[PDB]
């Protein structure tokens, strides 16, 4: 397991964050990959936790897309992706509360 | 055997490398030899070497010390000053493809004074600048909002060199003061309020 | 001036004898910079080197009593007491070590210097030392205690001879910054800052019985008393080369050993060069190495001791050089 | 099994703790020190095996460079201080080689200068290399590497 | 005016050259010992508060009002010196007065040249190609006898 | 070779005399 | 590169550590004296 | 530099460099003449002024570095102050030419 | 605390079946472990030009690789991987494949052997 993602990836350590999940309620929105499909959350604070990794996720872009290369195809790719998370965001914004 | 465009090539490198460096030579010559190449430098390509012919009496000189120091050749050619091979032969006596590649790879290695640290330490500061100009950009647009830049973050309690003034040392209270000085810089404070206004 | 010159002219120096060679002990394998006598007795003298080791040296025969191999780099300093039976010895290696007598072996490696240290001087009265490096500072040891009492911040560069005195200006510095210090240990302070050389001042020492100081810079060999800190002499050093050596005799007649290896003699407080002599070297060494790195008389002051860089140590034995000033 | 009769091991247990105490009061109390208050400029012993050379180079460098700013005027001297090691590297090199080291442009009291400190460095060299051949040659406490360079050194020597 | 006093002609001036008898006496043996008594006394203190320090074991007014000081004894658990943290400390110089640096009064051959490497490259800044005929008696002696002896033995 | 030459004696030392165990200064205080 | 030589050295005094050293120890309190 | 925040930033950056670039070269004295430079350029005059003695701590005796202080000094028409960094370079100096003579 | 480890600590209560069941449970969600072009540190045997910038990356110079599997294997049970390397001048996705029956391998529209 070395370069500490096999590391992370480690069933004692996801044994942990289960354990940690169950009692007190410590998750990690970061780990885990935010659902495609909104309304299969019924809870609040989850979806709040992932606009807030969605938005994390945008600003990440924002600050790679104008890099001094402007003329590469990776930069064009990520204004689609950006725009893609900024849909993603404005869907996590829905009306029901 | 030896080509003219790769012997050029070698002779250049040896210029930019050193005379007791040949691996990196040999490198640059695909097909060539460390060792070898060595040899040819000493052959051909260095200047201090007089390859060209001499003399009537010089010859004469030659061949006396080959009669009195039967074919030890080397000493000869020492001896002469002269290369060995040139001066047994004196005794003796009385693709493109290639090549266009392996020259565009040698210029570009001569050239380049680069490699891992140098070229990822400018590239790292490109970056940088870039990111800064992103940021300025985007303060720019959303304007209109109040807006703050955002610092450096600190790793081990260091100073911000905008405020606080650094280690300061004194003006040196001296006998001719007067007080205008302080009016002076007063002044040239308030030209810069209107520049940022 | 007119005025100071005829009278310059007027006052004469006194006849001190010449200088002849007498032993010469090629016995380490390395410079010989540093060299040391006791003060008590006059029948040893040592003499640390780029061998690493330290020799020991009995005058009278010539011969070599014994090593001592107690440092890793080489040793740039080495300082007898007089007080004690310590022998202090420094090194570039950082330490400053002590050598007990009674049994030869080190004792007190004093530790704080963060890089290769110059000089010891043991301070005369006090059972403390003083040492200072390239470190740029000068820290004065208990030697009880093995530790940096005090530590003299002043200098702005690497600081060579470092004597001391026991009046107040109790410790003599001598940079490469040309400045040489006299401080005050209990103030924790200097107290007066002789600027008055050009270049480093790589050589300094103290005279025996008139509480004065000559310090040497490449050329001008300055002398002064410290009880002011100010200015006694300058000496008729005026193309002599890189002063090494500044060692000051018990009857007035300051050597001065040099890069060029010219073994310069001067009358003290006169100013006077009264001799030159020309350096020598062994059939195999090369005529730039010879030069006199280290020297010091001994406590009567009839021998001259200078290790030289051919790897040997010349003692010397004993009509005066006509006054010309400017 | 089933002796008992403890009483001598536990003594000599006691004993070992009683050496234990000191050494635990200096170490275990020396680290709590350091996570209240964690040492400021801690000073390197040259002492060492390693760094030794290195240190020793540096002082021969230092003291060639003092020995150059002695010897004549100059302005803007930081500049021409790399130079001067940068010449006294060669030099170090052509002796290594046994190549001359002779450089027209260099004048005689500095080139003089930086022949005798080579020649001192090579003293130094030649000597430690033998006297790390000696040891080799008994059995004590050689370096792999250090023996490696000992090899290296002593050709160099030989076929100078 | 300010100038001339901060930097006085007898500083350059040495001593000795106009008197010759002049000499600075050996410091009183009484004031020496005195030197002596002041700066051990000091030193020692200075040495008994470094031990203090280390970590191992073995009255007052202000103003017109008088104040009584004390020591309290902190328990042997707890840090002693609570302050200190091993800080990094920049100092000021703090000189104020001016030091005044007094001195005195071929440049082609002592110039240096700037010499290139045959072995390294730091840069890898390309130059352009900066980079006994007597022999003894013997040499032809020998060669003498050797050929000469070889004809002998044909013959 | 001036070292050689004339009076003045060179000594080549090598060896130690005096043993490496014994002391250069002894602290002898009462029989 | 940044494998450079040098210029000069340094000596600044902080706040002293309090840490127990090992050769600091205690040894050797007893100095010696010469005879007179 | 269109803002004033914007300049802020660009200068503490620079002042950044400039201390990052001294710590290790401190004994350099070119680049502390530039970095006063960039503070005149900068119009804070105190910290350019601030600069330069540090400069002169580090090597009093560096004649340049003096004079283009001096310079500095009296480019901004501040002559007084000039005036007395000339006088404190004489008392310090006198057997240089240089500052008796500017 | 000490890369020779013998025992890692495990909680009173850790079934490891039960463990193992829950981190797979957990490891659909997860981000890492569900994912492709896992990393790599690897040298370049190939020693071939950046087809963007013509950057000559040569023999042996190592990179910090992603290593992805091929679904369509060679032949039957010998797998074949994709080795992603970027370009150091220019940010460009070089890439290579291992196909084994000529022991060596085959450039991946990333750039050219030389």
């Given at each position: 397991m070395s370069r500490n993602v096999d590391k992370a990836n480690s069933v004692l350590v996801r044994f942990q964050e289960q354990q940690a999940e169950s009692a007190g309620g410590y998750k990690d929105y970061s780990r885990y990959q935010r659902p495609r499909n909104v309304s299969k959350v019924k809870s609040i604070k989850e979806a709040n936790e992932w606009k807030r990794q969605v938005s994390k996720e945008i600003k990440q872009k924002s600050t790679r897309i104008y890099d001094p290369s402007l003329n590469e195809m990776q930069i064009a790719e990520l204004n689609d992706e950006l725009n893609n998370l900024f849909k993603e965001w404005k869907r996590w914004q829905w009306h029901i509360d | 055997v030896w080509t003219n465009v790769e012997d050029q090539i070698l002779k250049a490198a040896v210029q930019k490398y050193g005379t007791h460096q040949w691996s990196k030579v040999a490198s640059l010559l695909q097909k060539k030899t460390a060792r070898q190449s060595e040899l040819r430098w000493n052959e051909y390509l260095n200047p201090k070497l007089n390859?060209?012919?001499?003399?009537?009496?010089?010859?004469?000189?030659?061949?006396?010390?080959?009669?009195?120091?039967?074919?030890?050749?080397?000493?000869?050619?020492?001896?002469?000053?002269?290369?060995?091979?040139?001066?047994?032969?004196?005794?003796?006596?009385?693709?493109?493809?290639?090549?266009?590649?392996?020259?565009?790879?040698?210029?570009?290695?001569?050239?380049?004074?680069?490699?891992?640290?140098?070229?990822?330490?400018?590239?790292?500061?490109?970056?940088?600048?870039?990111?800064?100009?992103?940021?300025?950009?985007?303060?720019?647009?959303?304007?209109?909002?109040?807006?703050?830049?955002?610092?450096?973050?600190?790793?081990?309690?260091?100073?911000?060199?905008?405020?606080?003034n650094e280690d300061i040392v004194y003006e040196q209270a001296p006998m001719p003061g007067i007080y205008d000085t302080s009016t002076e810089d007063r002044q040239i404070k308030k030209k810069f309020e209107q520049f940022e206004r | 001036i007119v005025n100071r010159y005829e009278k310059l002219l007027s006052q004469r120096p006194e006849w001190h004898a010449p200088w002849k060679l007498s032993r010469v002990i090629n016995g380490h394998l390395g410079w010989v910079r540093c060299v040391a006598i006791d003060p008590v007795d006059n029948e040893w003298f040592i003499t640390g080197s780029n061998d690493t080791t330290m020799k020991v040296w009995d005058l009278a025969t010539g011969k070599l009593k014994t090593t001592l191999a107690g440092h890793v780099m080489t040793v740039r300093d080495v300082a007898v007491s007089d007080r004690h039976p310590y022998l202090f010895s420094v090194s570039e290696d950082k330490t400053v070590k002590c050598w007990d007598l009674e049994k030869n072996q080190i004792i007190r490696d004093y530790y704080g210097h963060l890089s290769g240290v110059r000089t010891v001087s043991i301070h005369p009265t006090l059972d403390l030392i003083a040492t200072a490096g390239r470190d740029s500072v000068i820290k004065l040891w208990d030697m009880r205690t093995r530790i940096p009492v005090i530590t003299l911040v002043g200098h702005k560069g690497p600081i060579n001879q470092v004597q001391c005195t026991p009046v107040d200006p109790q410790v003599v510095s001598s940079s490469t910054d040309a400045t040489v210090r006299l401080w005050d240990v209990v103030a924790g302070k200097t107290m007066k800052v002789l600027t008055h050389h050009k270049r480093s001042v790589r050589a300094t020492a103290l005279h025996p019985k008139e509480f004065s100081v000559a310090s040497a810079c490449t050329d001008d060999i300055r002398s002064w008393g410290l009880a002011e800190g100010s200015l006694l002499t300058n000496f008729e050093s005026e193309k002599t080369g890189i002063i090494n050596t500044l060692s000051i005799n018990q009857d007035?007649?300051?050597?001065?050993?040099?890069?060029?290896?010219?073994?310069?003699?001067?009358?003290?407080?006169?100013?006077?060069?009264?001799?030159?002599?020309?350096?020598?070297?062994?059939v195999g060494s090369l005529e730039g190495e010879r030069s006199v790195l280290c020297s010091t008389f001994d406590k009567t002051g009839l021998r001259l001791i200078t290790g030289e860089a051919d790897k040997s140590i010349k003692i010397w034995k004993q009509p005066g050089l006509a006054w010309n000033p400017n | 099994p089933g002796c008992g009769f403890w009483q001598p091991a536990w003594r000599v247990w006691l004993n070992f703790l009683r050496g234990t105490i000191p050494l635990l009061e200096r170490y275990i109390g020396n680290l709590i020190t350091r996570q209240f208050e964690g040492r400021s400029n801690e000073i390197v012993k040259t002492t060492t095996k390693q760094r030794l050379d290195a240190y020793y180079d540096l002082e021969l460098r230092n003291s060639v460079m003092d020995d150059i700013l002695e010897m004549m005027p100059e302005s803007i001297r930081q500049k021409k201080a790399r130079t001067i090691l940068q010449h006294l590297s060669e030099a170090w090199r052509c002796w290594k080689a046994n190549i001359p080291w002779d450089v027209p442009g260099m004048p005689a009291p500095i080139k003089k200068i930086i022949e005798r400190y080579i020649k001192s460095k090579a003293d130094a060299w030649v000597s430690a290399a033998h006297y790390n051949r000696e040891r080799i040659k008994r059995g004590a406490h050689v370096e792999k590497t250090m023996v490696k360079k000992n090899l290296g050194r002593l050709t160099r020597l030989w076929i100078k | 005016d300010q100038i001339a006093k901060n930097v006085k002609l007898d500083d350059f001036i040495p001593k000795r050259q106009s008197n010759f008898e002049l000499s600075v006496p050996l410091p009183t043996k009484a004031e020496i010992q005195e030197c002596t008594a002041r700066t051990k006394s000091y030193i020692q203190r200075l040495v008994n508060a470094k031990l203090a320090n280390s970590n191992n074991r073995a009255l007052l007014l202000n103003n017109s009002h008088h104040i009584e000081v004390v020591s309290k004894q902190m328990d042997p658990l707890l840090p002693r010196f609570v302050g200190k943290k091993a800080r990094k400390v920049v100092a000021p110089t703090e000189n104020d007065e001016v030091v005044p640096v007094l001195h005195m009064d071929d440049p082609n051959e002592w110039k240096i040249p700037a010499a290139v490497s045959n072995w390294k490259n730091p840069n890898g800044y390309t130059v352009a190609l900066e980079r006994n005929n007597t022999i003894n008696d013997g040499f032809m002696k020998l060669s003498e006898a050797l050929e000469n002896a070889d004809k002998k033995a044909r013959q | 070779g001036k070292e050689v030459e004339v009076l003045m004696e060179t000594k080549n030392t090598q060896s130690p005399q005096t043993p490496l165990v014994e002391p250069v200064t002894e602290r002898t205080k009462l029989q | 590169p940044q494998l450079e030589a040098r210029s000069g050295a340094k000596a600044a005094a902080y706040t002293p550590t309090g840490i127990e050293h090992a050769r600091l120890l205690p040894g050797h309190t007893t100095l010696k004296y010469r005879k007179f | 530099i269109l803002d004033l925040?914007?300049?802020?930033?660009?200068?503490?950056?620079?002042?950044?460099?400039?201390?990052?670039?001294?710590?290790?070269?401190?004994?350099?004295?070119?680049?502390?003449?530039?970095?006063?430079?960039?503070?005149?350029?900068?119009?804070?005059?105190?910290?350019?002024?601030?600069?330069?003695?540090?400069?002169?701590?580090?090597?009093?005796?560096?004649?340049?570095?003096?004079?283009?202080?001096?310079?500095?000094?009296?480019?901004?028409?501040?002559?007084?102050?000039?005036?007395?960094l000339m006088n404190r370079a004489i008392s310090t100096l006198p057997r240089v030419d240089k500052l008796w003579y500017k | 605390?000490?890369?020779?480890?013998?025992?890692?600590?495990?909680?009173?209560?850790?079934?490891?079946?039960?463990?193992?069941?829950?981190?797979?449970?957990?490891?659909?969600?997860?981000?890492?472990?569900?994912?492709?072009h896992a990393s790599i540190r690897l040298m370049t045997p190939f020693s071939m030009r950046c087809l963007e910038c013509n950057e000559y990356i040569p023999k042996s110079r190592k990179f910090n690789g992603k290593k992805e599997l091929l679904?369509?294997?060679?032949?039957?049970?010998?797998?074949?991987?994709?080795?992603?390397?970027?370009?150091?001048?220019?940010?460009?996705?070089?890439?290579?494949?291992?196909?084994?029956?000529?022991?060596?391998?085959?450039?991946?529209?990333?750039g050219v052997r030389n």
């Amino acid at each position: 397991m070395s370069r500490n993602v096999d590391k992370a990836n480690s069933v004692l350590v996801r044994f942990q964050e289960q354990q940690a999940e169950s009692a007190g309620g410590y998750k990690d929105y970061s780990r885990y990959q935010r659902p495609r499909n909104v309304s299969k959350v019924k809870s609040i604070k989850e979806a709040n936790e992932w606009k807030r990794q969605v938005s994390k996720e945008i600003k990440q872009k924002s600050t790679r897309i104008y890099d001094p290369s402007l003329n590469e195809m990776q930069i064009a790719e990520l204004n689609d992706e950006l725009n893609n998370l900024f849909k993603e965001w404005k869907r996590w914004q829905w009306h029901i509360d | 055997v030896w080509t003219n465009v790769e012997d050029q090539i070698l002779k250049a490198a040896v210029q930019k490398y050193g005379t007791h460096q040949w691996s990196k030579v040999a490198s640059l010559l695909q097909k060539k030899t460390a060792r070898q190449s060595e040899l040819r430098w000493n052959e051909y390509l260095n200047p201090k070497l007089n390859f060209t012919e001499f003399s009537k009496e010089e010859d004469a000189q030659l061949l006396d010390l080959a009669r009195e120091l039967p074919n030890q050749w080397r000493t000869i050619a020492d001896m002469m000053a002269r290369p060995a091979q040139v001066c047994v032969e004196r005794y003796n006596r009385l693709l493109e493809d290639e090549e266009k590649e392996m020259l565009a790879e040698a210029r570009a290695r001569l050239l380049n004074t680069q490699g891992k640290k140098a070229t990822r330490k400018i590239r790292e500061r490109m970056l940088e600048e870039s990111k800064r100009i992103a940021e300025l950009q985007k303060r720019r647009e959303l304007k209109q909002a109040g807006i703050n830049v955002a610092i450096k973050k600190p790793k081990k309690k260091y100073g911000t060199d905008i405020d606080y003034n650094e280690d300061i040392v004194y003006e040196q209270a001296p006998m001719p003061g007067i007080y205008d000085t302080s009016t002076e810089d007063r002044q040239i404070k308030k030209k810069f309020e209107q520049f940022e206004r | 001036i007119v005025n100071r010159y005829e009278k310059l002219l007027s006052q004469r120096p006194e006849w001190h004898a010449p200088w002849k060679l007498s032993r010469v002990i090629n016995g380490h394998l390395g410079w010989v910079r540093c060299v040391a006598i006791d003060p008590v007795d006059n029948e040893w003298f040592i003499t640390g080197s780029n061998d690493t080791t330290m020799k020991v040296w009995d005058l009278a025969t010539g011969k070599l009593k014994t090593t001592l191999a107690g440092h890793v780099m080489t040793v740039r300093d080495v300082a007898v007491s007089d007080r004690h039976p310590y022998l202090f010895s420094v090194s570039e290696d950082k330490t400053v070590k002590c050598w007990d007598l009674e049994k030869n072996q080190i004792i007190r490696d004093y530790y704080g210097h963060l890089s290769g240290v110059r000089t010891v001087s043991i301070h005369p009265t006090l059972d403390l030392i003083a040492t200072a490096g390239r470190d740029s500072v000068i820290k004065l040891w208990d030697m009880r205690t093995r530790i940096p009492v005090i530590t003299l911040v002043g200098h702005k560069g690497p600081i060579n001879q470092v004597q001391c005195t026991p009046v107040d200006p109790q410790v003599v510095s001598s940079s490469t910054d040309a400045t040489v210090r006299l401080w005050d240990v209990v103030a924790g302070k200097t107290m007066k800052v002789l600027t008055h050389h050009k270049r480093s001042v790589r050589a300094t020492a103290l005279h025996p019985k008139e509480f004065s100081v000559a310090s040497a810079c490449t050329d001008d060999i300055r002398s002064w008393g410290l009880a002011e800190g100010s200015l006694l002499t300058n000496f008729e050093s005026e193309k002599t080369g890189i002063i090494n050596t500044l060692s000051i005799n018990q009857d007035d007649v300051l050597f001065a050993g040099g890069d060029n290896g010219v073994l310069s003699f001067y009358d003290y407080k006169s100013g006077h060069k009264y001799q030159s002599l020309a350096t020598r070297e062994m059939v195999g060494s090369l005529e730039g190495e010879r030069s006199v790195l280290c020297s010091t008389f001994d406590k009567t002051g009839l021998r001259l001791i200078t290790g030289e860089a051919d790897k040997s140590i010349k003692i010397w034995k004993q009509p005066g050089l006509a006054w010309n000033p400017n | 099994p089933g002796c008992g009769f403890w009483q001598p091991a536990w003594r000599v247990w006691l004993n070992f703790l009683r050496g234990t105490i000191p050494l635990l009061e200096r170490y275990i109390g020396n680290l709590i020190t350091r996570q209240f208050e964690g040492r400021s400029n801690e000073i390197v012993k040259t002492t060492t095996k390693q760094r030794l050379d290195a240190y020793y180079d540096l002082e021969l460098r230092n003291s060639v460079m003092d020995d150059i700013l002695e010897m004549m005027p100059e302005s803007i001297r930081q500049k021409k201080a790399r130079t001067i090691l940068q010449h006294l590297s060669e030099a170090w090199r052509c002796w290594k080689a046994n190549i001359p080291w002779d450089v027209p442009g260099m004048p005689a009291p500095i080139k003089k200068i930086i022949e005798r400190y080579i020649k001192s460095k090579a003293d130094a060299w030649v000597s430690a290399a033998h006297y790390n051949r000696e040891r080799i040659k008994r059995g004590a406490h050689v370096e792999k590497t250090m023996v490696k360079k000992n090899l290296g050194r002593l050709t160099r020597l030989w076929i100078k | 005016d300010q100038i001339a006093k901060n930097v006085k002609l007898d500083d350059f001036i040495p001593k000795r050259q106009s008197n010759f008898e002049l000499s600075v006496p050996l410091p009183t043996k009484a004031e020496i010992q005195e030197c002596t008594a002041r700066t051990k006394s000091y030193i020692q203190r200075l040495v008994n508060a470094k031990l203090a320090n280390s970590n191992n074991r073995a009255l007052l007014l202000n103003n017109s009002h008088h104040i009584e000081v004390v020591s309290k004894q902190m328990d042997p658990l707890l840090p002693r010196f609570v302050g200190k943290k091993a800080r990094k400390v920049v100092a000021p110089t703090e000189n104020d007065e001016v030091v005044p640096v007094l001195h005195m009064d071929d440049p082609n051959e002592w110039k240096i040249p700037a010499a290139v490497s045959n072995w390294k490259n730091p840069n890898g800044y390309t130059v352009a190609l900066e980079r006994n005929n007597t022999i003894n008696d013997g040499f032809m002696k020998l060669s003498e006898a050797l050929e000469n002896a070889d004809k002998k033995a044909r013959q | 070779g001036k070292e050689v030459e004339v009076l003045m004696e060179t000594k080549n030392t090598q060896s130690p005399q005096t043993p490496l165990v014994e002391p250069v200064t002894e602290r002898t205080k009462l029989q | 590169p940044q494998l450079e030589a040098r210029s000069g050295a340094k000596a600044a005094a902080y706040t002293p550590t309090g840490i127990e050293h090992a050769r600091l120890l205690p040894g050797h309190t007893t100095l010696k004296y010469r005879k007179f | 530099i269109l803002d004033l925040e914007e300049l802020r930033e660009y200068q503490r950056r620079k002042r950044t460099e400039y201390e990052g670039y001294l710590k290790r070269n401190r004994l350099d004295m070119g680049q502390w003449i530039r970095y006063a430079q960039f503070e005149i350029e900068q119009h804070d005059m105190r910290r350019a002024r601030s600069i330069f003695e540090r400069a002169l701590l580090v090597d009093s005796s560096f004649i340049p570095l003096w004079i283009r202080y001096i310079d500095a000094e009296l480019k901004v028409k501040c002559i007084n102050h000039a005036r007395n960094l000339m006088n404190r370079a004489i008392s310090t100096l006198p057997r240089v030419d240089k500052l008796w003579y500017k | 605390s000490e890369r020779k480890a013998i025992n890692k600590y495990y909680p009173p209560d850790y079934n490891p079946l039960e463990a193992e069941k829950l981190s797979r449970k957990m490891a659909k969600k997860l981000k890492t472990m569900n994912k492709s072009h896992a990393s790599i540190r690897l040298m370049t045997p190939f020693s071939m030009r950046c087809l963007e910038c013509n950057e000559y990356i040569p023999k042996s110079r190592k990179f910090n690789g992603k290593k992805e599997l091929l679904k369509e294997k060679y032949l039957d049970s010998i797998k074949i991987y994709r080795l992603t390397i970027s370009c150091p001048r220019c940010a460009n996705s070089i890439a290579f494949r291992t196909d084994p029956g000529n022991s060596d391998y085959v450039m991946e529209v990333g750039g050219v052997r030389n």
